[PDB]
From a paper:
In Gram-positive bacteria, nitrogen homeostasis is controlled by an operon encoding glutamine synthetase (GS), a dodecameric machine that assimilates ammonium into glutamine, and the GlnR repressor. GlnR detects nitrogen excess indirectly by binding glutamine-feedback-inhibited-GS (FBI-GS), which activates its transcription-repression function. GS generates glutamine from glutamate, ATP, and ammonium by a mechanism that involves the initial phosphorylation of the γ-carboxyl group of glutamate by ATP and the subsequent incorporation of ammonium. The structures show FBI-GS binds the GlnR C-terminal domain within its active-site cavity, juxtaposing two GlnR monomers to form a DNA-binding-competent GlnR dimer.
We next obtained structures of Sa GlnR and Lm GlnR bound to a 21 bp glnR consensus operator site to 2.35 and 3.45 Å, respectively, by X-ray crystallography. The Lm and Sa GlnRs form comparable dimers to the Bs GlnR and dock on the DNA similarly. As observed in the Bs structure, both DNA sites bound by Sa and Lm GlnR are bent inward but the DNA from the Lm complex is slightly less bent (~21°) compared to the Sa and Bs structures (~25°). However, like Bs GlnR, the Sa and Lm GlnR surfaces that contact the DNA are both electropositive, indicating electrostatics as a general contributor to GlnR DNA binding. The GlnR DNA used for crystallization contains four conserved bps (bolded) in each half-site, 5′-CGTGTCAGATAATCTGACACG-3′ (where the consensus binding site is N1N2T3G4T5N6A7N(7)T7’N6’A5’C4’A3’N2’N1’; N indicates any nucleotide). These conserved bps are contacted in the major groove by Lm and Sa GlnR residues that are completely conserved among GlnRs; a conserved tyrosine (Sa Tyr32/Lm Tyr31) makes hydrophobic contacts to the DNA thymine3 (T3) methyl group, an arginine (Sa Arg28/Lm Arg27) specifically reads the G4 base and makes hydrophobic interactions with the methyl moiety of T5 and finally, the side chain methylene carbons of a conserved arginine (Sa Arg31/Lm Arg30) contacts the T7′ methyl group. However, GlnR proteins contain different wing residues, which our structures show make distinct contacts to the minor groove; wing residues Bs Arg46 and Sa Lys48 make nonspecific base contacts in the minor groove, but the corresponding Lm GlnR residue, His47, makes hydrophobic contacts to a ribose. To test the role of this wing residue in operator DNA-binding affinity, we mutated the Sa GlnR Lys48 residue to arginine and histidine, which are found in Bs and Lm GlnR and performed FP studies. The Kds determined in these experiments were 9.9 ± 0.8 nM, 8.0 ± 0.6 nM, and 11.6 ± 0.6 nM for WT Sa GlnR(1-87), Sa GlnR(1-87)K48R, and Sa GlnR(1-87)K48H, respectively. Thus, these data indicate that the different wing contacts by GlnR proteins do not significantly impact operator binding affinity. The Sa GlnR dimer is generated by interacting N-terminal loops, while the Lm and the Bs N-terminal regions fold into distorted helices that interact.
Residue numbers in the entry:
A (entry chain E), B (entry chain B): 6 to 83
DNA sequence: CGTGTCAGATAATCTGACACG
DNA sequence: CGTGTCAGATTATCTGACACG
C-alpha cells in the first residue's frame, strides 16, 4: 500500500539500504542522475524508485563506468 | 527493503502515513502498545509492522476502547 | 485521560570547499 | 573526477511541563 514513487526514506535510512555514503547520494543528484523529493526544510526524501535507481548507479560504478557514461546508460536503455 | 520488521520511516513520515500526530504516537509507546527501534541518537525509526500496529490502535480508539482495553486486544497470545 | 501546544536540548541533514587517490 | 572529511547553518525529533476539553 506504499507506492514506489512515494517519498518515504530519509538520508540515513537510504544510505544504509544502499551501502552508499550521504556524500555519494548527493553527488549523483548533482549530476542529474536522480532528483529526490524535498521536505519544506529542504531535506531529501527518497522513494523505492529512488532506491532502485541508486543501486543501478552503484553497480555500474563497480563495473568501472564513468558518471558521464552512466548518464547515457540510465537514459538510453530503451 | 520490504523486510516488514525493518525500521525505515522517520517520525514525520509515520505521522503522515498513519494520520496520527507525533504526540499520539509517542504516547502509545510510553503506555507500552508499541516499541520502535531507535537510532544511536534516540530518534525513533518505525517499520511496516509498526505502521500496522499504529493503524490497529487508531481504529480501536475510534471504536471506543481504552488504552488498557487495547493493550489486552493486541498482546497476550501473540 | 488523551491530545494540543510551547521550551529547551540534541540529533540529523543541509551546502560548500579542501584533500586525496 | 569520484569520494572523505570538516566547517558552519538550519531542520527535525527529543523530553518534559502547563492547558484544556
Ligand atoms: Ca515536498
Amino acid at each position: 500500500a506504499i507506492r514506489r514513487n512515494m517519498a518515504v526514506f530519509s538520508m540515513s535510512v537510504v544510505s544504509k539500504l544502499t551501502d552508499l555514503t550521504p556524500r555519494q547520494i548527493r553527488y549523483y543528484e548533482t549530476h542529474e542522475l536522480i532528483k529526490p523529493e524535498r521536505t519544506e526544510g529542504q531535506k531529501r526524501l527518497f522513494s523505492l524508485n529512488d532506491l532502485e535507481r541508486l543501486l543501478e548507479i552503484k553497480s555500474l560504478l563497480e563495473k568501472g563506468f564513468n558518471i558521464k557514461e552512466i548518464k547515457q546508460i540510465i537514459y538510453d536503455s530503451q
